[PDB]
Amino acid sequence: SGFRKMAFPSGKVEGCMVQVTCGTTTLNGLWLDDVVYCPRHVICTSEDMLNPNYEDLLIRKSNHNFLVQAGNVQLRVIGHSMQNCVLKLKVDTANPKTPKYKFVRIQPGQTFSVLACYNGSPSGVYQCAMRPNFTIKGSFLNGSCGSVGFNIDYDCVSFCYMHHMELPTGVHAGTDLEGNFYGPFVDRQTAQAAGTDTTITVNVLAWLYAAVINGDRWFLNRFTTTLNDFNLVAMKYNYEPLTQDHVDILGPLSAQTGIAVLDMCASLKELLQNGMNGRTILGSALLEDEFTPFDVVRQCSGVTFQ
Amino acid sequence: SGFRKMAFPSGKVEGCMVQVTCGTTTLNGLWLDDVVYCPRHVICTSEDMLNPNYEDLLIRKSNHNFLVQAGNVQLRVIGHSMQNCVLKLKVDTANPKTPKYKFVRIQPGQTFSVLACYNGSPSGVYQCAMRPNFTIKGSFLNGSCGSVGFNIDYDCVSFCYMHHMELPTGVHAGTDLEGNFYGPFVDRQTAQAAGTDTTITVNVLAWLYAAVINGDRWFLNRFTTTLNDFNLVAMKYNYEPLTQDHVDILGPLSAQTGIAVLDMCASLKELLQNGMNGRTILGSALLEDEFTPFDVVRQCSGVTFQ
Numbered sequence: 001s002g003f004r005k006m007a008f009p010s011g012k013v014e015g016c017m018v019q020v021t022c023g024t025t026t027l028n029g030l031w032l033d034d035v036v037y038c039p040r041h042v043i044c045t046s047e048d049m050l051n052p053n054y055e056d057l058l059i060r061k062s063n064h065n066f067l068v069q070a071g072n073v074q075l076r077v078i079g080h081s082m083q084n085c086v087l088k089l090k091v092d093t094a095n096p097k098t099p100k101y102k103f104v105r106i107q108p109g110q111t112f113s114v115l116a117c118y119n120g121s122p123s124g125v126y127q128c129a130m131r132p133n134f135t136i137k138g139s140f141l142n143g144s145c146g147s148v149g150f151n152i153d154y155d156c157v158s159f160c161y162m163h164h165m166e167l168p169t170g171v172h173a174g175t176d177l178e179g180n181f182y183g184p185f186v187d188r189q190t191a192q193a194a195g196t197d198t199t200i201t202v203n204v205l206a207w208l209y210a211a212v213i214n215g216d217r218w219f220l221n222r223f224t225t226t227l228n229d230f231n232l233v234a235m236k237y238n239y240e241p242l243t244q245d246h247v248d249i250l251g252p253l254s255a256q257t258g259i260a261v262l263d264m265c266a267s268l269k270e271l272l273q274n275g276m277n278g279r280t281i282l283g284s285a286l287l288e289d290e291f292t293p294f295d296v297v298r299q300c301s302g303v304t305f306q
Numbered sequence: 307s308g309f310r311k312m313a314f315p316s317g318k319v320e321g322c323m324v325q326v327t328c329g330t331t332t333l334n335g336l337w338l339d340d341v342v343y344c345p346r347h348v349i350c351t352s353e354d355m356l357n358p359n360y361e362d363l364l365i366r367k368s369n370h371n372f373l374v375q376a377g378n379v380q381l382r383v384i385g386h387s388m389q390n391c392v393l394k395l396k397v398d399t400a401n402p403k404t405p406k407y408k409f410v411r412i413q414p415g416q417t418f419s420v421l422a423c424y425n426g427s428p429s430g431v432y433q434c435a436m437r438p439n440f441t442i443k444g445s446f447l448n449g450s451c452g453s454v455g456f457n458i459d460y461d462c463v464s465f466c467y468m469h470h471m472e473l474p475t476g477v478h479a480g481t482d483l484e485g486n487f488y489g490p491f492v493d494r495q496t497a498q499a500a501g502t503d504t505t506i507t508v509n510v511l512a513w514l515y516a517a518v519i520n521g522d523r524w525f526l527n528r529f530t531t532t533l534n535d536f537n538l539v540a541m542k543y544n545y546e547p548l549t550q551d552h553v554d555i556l557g558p559l560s561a562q563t564g565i566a567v568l569d570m571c572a573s574l575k576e577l578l579q580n581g582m583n584g585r586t587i588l589g590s591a592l593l594e595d596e597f598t599p600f601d602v603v604r605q606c607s608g609v610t611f612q
């Protein structure tokens with residue numbers, strides 16, 4: 001019993017974290033096979049983050065300008081290239097701790113674990129979601145760039161995020177492992193403001209099913225609704241519109257608990273219109289939206305990883 | 307910026323998790339050097355959890371009755387002994403992934419990371435606190451027994467919890483790694499109810515400092531108070547009494563933010579008496595008490611682990 005914000009085991013990713021230093025800038029890199037991936041703004045100095053021309057800044061960089069340190073050993077850089085907003089540093093040693101892995105570009109609403117690192121050393125792990133405005137609400141300080149977000153399916157690590165920037169509002173932005181930013185953000189210290197932080201409706205519903213499974217049932221009402229009628233309420237509270245795809249994805253949780261998806265929507269509707277009246281759900285006083293339906297099934301069924 | 311429920315990197319502990327099977331019962335064990343630690347109720351059957359006599363049940367067990375599997379390899383058990391509520395299974399192979407480690411019995415209010423496991427395979431990691439009633443609010447399903455809680459100080463893993471039981475109320479109980487239960491709980495399926503779940507006052511205050519550091523300052527009032535006057539409010543809301551030791555421990559956070567500890571107490575007092583009026587603090591609608599002062603400093607300063 002009990003439901004917690006749960007991250008994947010980070011050991012497979014810890015063995016891939018290295019320290020990359022260019023000039024006086026040090027951040028983290030990801031060492032997979034014989035390539036080290038890191039944010040391209042490692043080549044930037046302080047005066048340059050306002051308006052960097054990365055192509056021009058890279059002309060003055062050779063392989064030996066990139067210092068890559070794994071633990072206490074220096075990796076030999078034998079080639080380097082820029083792919084979008086990441087650099088790929090070819091090293092002469094394949095990472096012996098390389099796990100089975102994929103590179104995935106996730107959709108908004110999807111969750112992943114972040115291994116926060118500093119100077120190539122892991123500091124902590126927590127669970128994140130890609131917000132609908134393509135930011136993430138993480139915990140990152142100076143030097144955390146290059147920290148990655150990932151999912152694990154048994155023995156395969158799916159890397160989906162690399163941390164690049166912190167916006168003036170305290171939220172965070174980054175790229176996939178191909179170097180393409182999530183959302184409209186750029187690796188420049190400029191005026192870029194995040195859009196509306198809408199709530200991930202399907203995730204709240206999943207979390208409500210998780211609450212029912214674990215004994216929190218006070219919010220179950222006597223009402224039902226339709227997708228169109230619920231979405232009229234979702235729009236007012238800046239909730240994502242619920243689609244039939246979302247209903248379908250919640251099928252398994254609906255079947256296990258015997259509560260029709262549209263019944264749970266009517267329960268959510270009452271919670272949005274009347275608040276929680278000082279009660280709590282799974283130890284929270286607000287509606288949680290960073291659990292996916294698959295996360296709930298995983299944690300309520302005990303899926304492991306080899 | 308940003309403040310998150312953050313667990314330690316679990317890689318050092320993942321390499322120690324094994325599967326222990328006795329008869330038809332399978333749970334998790336912790337393999338350090340040439341000893342495997344696991345809950346002693348691995349030797350129990352279903353009819354036996356009501357009133358087990360472990361000394362008698364152990365008489366019918368030999369070394370070869372304990373099947374210990376690390377990954378896909380069978381470990382050779384060459385000795386076994388019961389220490390309080392854990393079994394120590396001497397194996398003939400030292401764990402080559404053994405990290406620097408200690409065994410620590412933590413105090414209530416202290417936090418730690420849990421590596422939830424099933425069949426010796428890690429499933430996820432999350433942060434927990436030892437509640438003042440000596441329970442923990444975890445996420446454990448059948449087969450999770452033997453999962454451990456731990457802290458890391460750079461390169462030393464301090465193991466402080468092994469999971470044993472789930473109470474009828476959905477909370478969790480366990481032992482230190484010497485086999486002594488936290489609180490009055492026993493490894494028997496009996497009537498044992500948890501006491502008052504009081505709030506860890508010093509941890510809430512630490513978390514309020516973390517909020518100030520990250521830009522949430524609306525709760526800062528114009529008032530101050532005394533320890534005795536604040537504690538009169540703490541008692542009403544089932545808060546731990548604050549002591550001078552607690553004030554001293556908050557010194558560093560007080561100095562960094564320039565807010566006297568007793569000023570922050572007066573802010574907490576107003577929050578308890580008037581609620582949050584629908585606002586949030588660090589993304590929460592309730593007062594969080596599972597961050598220690600040391601946790602806040604760690605996450606706000608970027609401490610790493612080698």
Ligand SMILES: CCc1cc(O)c(Oc2ccc(C(N)=O)cc2F)cc1F
Pocket residue numbers: 041044048049050052140141142143144145164165166172187188189307
């Ligand atoms: C030119 C691109 C660029 C380079 C930087 O080095 C940079 O610096 C930071 C990045 C992230 C954080 C944080 N806390 O996540 C803090 C930082 F100072 C920002 C930035 F856009």
Ligand SMILES: CCc1cc(O)c(Oc2ccc(C(N)=O)cc2F)cc1F
Pocket residue numbers: 001347350354355356358446447448449450451470471472478493494495
């Ligand atoms: C005789 C001692 C004993 C043996 C058990 O095997 C047991 O079983 C469970 C333990 C923990 C959980 C959970 N979800 O944490 C679930 C369980 F069924 C309980 C118990 F007291």
